[PDB]
Write a structure and sequence with these properties.
The structure is cut from a larger assembly and holds 2 copies of chain A (49 residues). Chain A has 49 residues and is mainly alpha-helical. Chain A is built from 1 helix and no strands.
Chain lengths: 49, 49
């Protein structure tokens, strides 16, 4: 809510917490992607050998 | 004498094959070690931050 002062003053905190959660999840997905790429490279080398 | 020479030749060819198999084993082992090393390097680069 924003029609009063308290609504905005508490909207600030709720938005901060939401952003924290979003950023942590994005970091985790990036880590997964890196690991999968490394697995692919190793598989290709072993198959050639 | 000719049978002795025959036995020697027949042994020599399979010896060649066995040596080649040893080469293949060494190749595979080195192939895996290289990837282990790359991952360790990345961890160190992350941790100096």
């Amino acid at each position: 809510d924003v029609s009063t002062v308290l609504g905005a003053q508490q909207a600030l905190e709720v938005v901060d917490k939401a952003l924290g959660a979003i950023n942590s999840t994005r970091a985790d997905l990036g880590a997964i992607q890196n690991r999968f790429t490394s697995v692919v490279a190793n598989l290709q080398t072993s198959s050639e050998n | 004498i000719s049978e002795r020479f025959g036995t020697q030749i027949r042994g020599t060819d399979v010896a060649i094959r066995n040596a080649n198999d040893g080469i293949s084993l060494a190749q595979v082992a080195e192939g895996s070690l290289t990837e282990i090393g790359n991952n360790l390097q990345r961890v160190r680069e992350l941790s100096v931050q």
